[PDB]
Amino acid sequence: SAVTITLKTLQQQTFKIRMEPDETVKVLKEKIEAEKGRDAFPVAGQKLIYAGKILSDDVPIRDYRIDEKNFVVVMVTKTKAGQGTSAPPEASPTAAPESSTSFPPAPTSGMSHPPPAAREDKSPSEESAPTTSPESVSGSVPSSGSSGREEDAASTLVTGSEYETMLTEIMSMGYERERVVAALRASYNNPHRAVEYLLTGIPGSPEPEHGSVQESQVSEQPATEAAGENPLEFLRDQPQFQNMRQVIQQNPALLPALLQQLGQENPQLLQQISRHQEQFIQMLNEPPGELADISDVEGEVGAIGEEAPQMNYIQVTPQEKEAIERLKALGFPESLVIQAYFACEKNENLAANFLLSQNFDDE
């Protein structure tokens, strides 16, 4: 089964083909190259005219309803393949009916498209909507409520190590590594929400109330009987250290010249300087000691406290000491206060109250 096709070329040369009554016209373009040949029948200008509109090569033959009784004026122009056929400048025009008049610039650009008459020049939006799919607008329940995303706060601490830089900001407290980021991924990657939701809120510390740290044991010296036989204080006051603390306050070359001259003459300190070279020298340039903390002067000049180890008959307690502390702090005596306290009701007036009325000023 088949069907001959009337092929007509603009050159006035017609013939006949056949192929199948359902082959893409693309085979036609190639059928013409073999039907007429390839001397002056290229493909670029291959337009199969059957009655005005050239049949394209994207449809199967017989789809345009061609008629063998008629003829298809196929065209074969447009020869742009690098180097093919061309035309010299000396020639005559053959477009009587199709005579060119305007001079539209093919190359270059330009927006030649003026609107007809004087109406709405601009054209915002349109006035039609051709649906592409047959059943696109379907369904009913919402699945993705995308009514505006969320930016929230992210660049709050993340740096070179982003969350790791913060991981050290919190972990340093004494936490872990994976538990902290998790605390910094659900609380707000911050030491505020993470901490609160790191142990007291995170599933890692159910009511952490068993870590009492109210000890404060950093400074608490007795200073009541801790001094005797010290190879360092006798020199600090003797001429040995004075020569090492005076020569050092002008030239560091004397330190060695002295440590080897006097510092290396008395074994009383040498047996310690070998291991105390750090502290012994620390005092050579800056000896410790201070007689003015902030205001050592409540009563008159300011004493130290109890400078009598095993001397009095009692030792006061944490109940009456408050009365004496404020007494000697206002300008009261010493033994006259610790004793007079037992005036009438062991109060802070009968004993003081009468003491003040007895001091008076002048009559």
UniProtKB/Swiss-Prot annotation:
Positions of the UniProt region annotated as Disordered: 81-160, 203-227
| Ribosomal protein among keywords | no
Cellular component, GO, one term: nucleoplasm
Q: Which residues form the Ubiquitin-like domain?
A: 1-81
Alphabetized UniProt keyword annotations: DNA damage, DNA repair, Host-virus interaction, Isopeptide bond, Nucleus, Phosphoprotein, Proteasome, Repeat, Ubl conjugation
Enumerate the spans annotated as UBA domain: 161-201, 318-358
Q: Give the disulfide map.
A: none
Q: What is known of its domains?
A: The ubiquitin-like domain mediates interaction with ATXN3.
Q: Which family does it belong to?
A: Belongs to the RAD23 family.
Role this protein plays:
Multiubiquitin chain receptor involved in modulation of proteasomal degradation. Binds to 'Lys-48'-linked polyubiquitin chains in a length-dependent manner and with a lower affinity to 'Lys-63'-linked polyubiquitin chains. Proposed to be capable to bind simultaneously to the 26S proteasome and to polyubiquitinated substrates and to deliver ubiquitinated proteins to the proteasome. Involved in nucleotide excision repair and is thought to be functional equivalent for RAD23B in global genome nucleotide excision repair (GG-NER) by association with XPC. In vitro, the XPC:RAD23A dimer has NER activity. Can stabilize XPC.
**Quaternary structure and interacting proteins, as annotated:** Interacts with XPC; the interaction is suggesting the existence of a functional equivalent variant XPC complex. Interacts with PSMD4 and PSMC5. Interacts with ATXN3. Interacts with UBQLN2.
- What is the protein name stated in its UniProt record? UV excision repair protein RAD23 homolog A
| Primary gene name | RAD23A
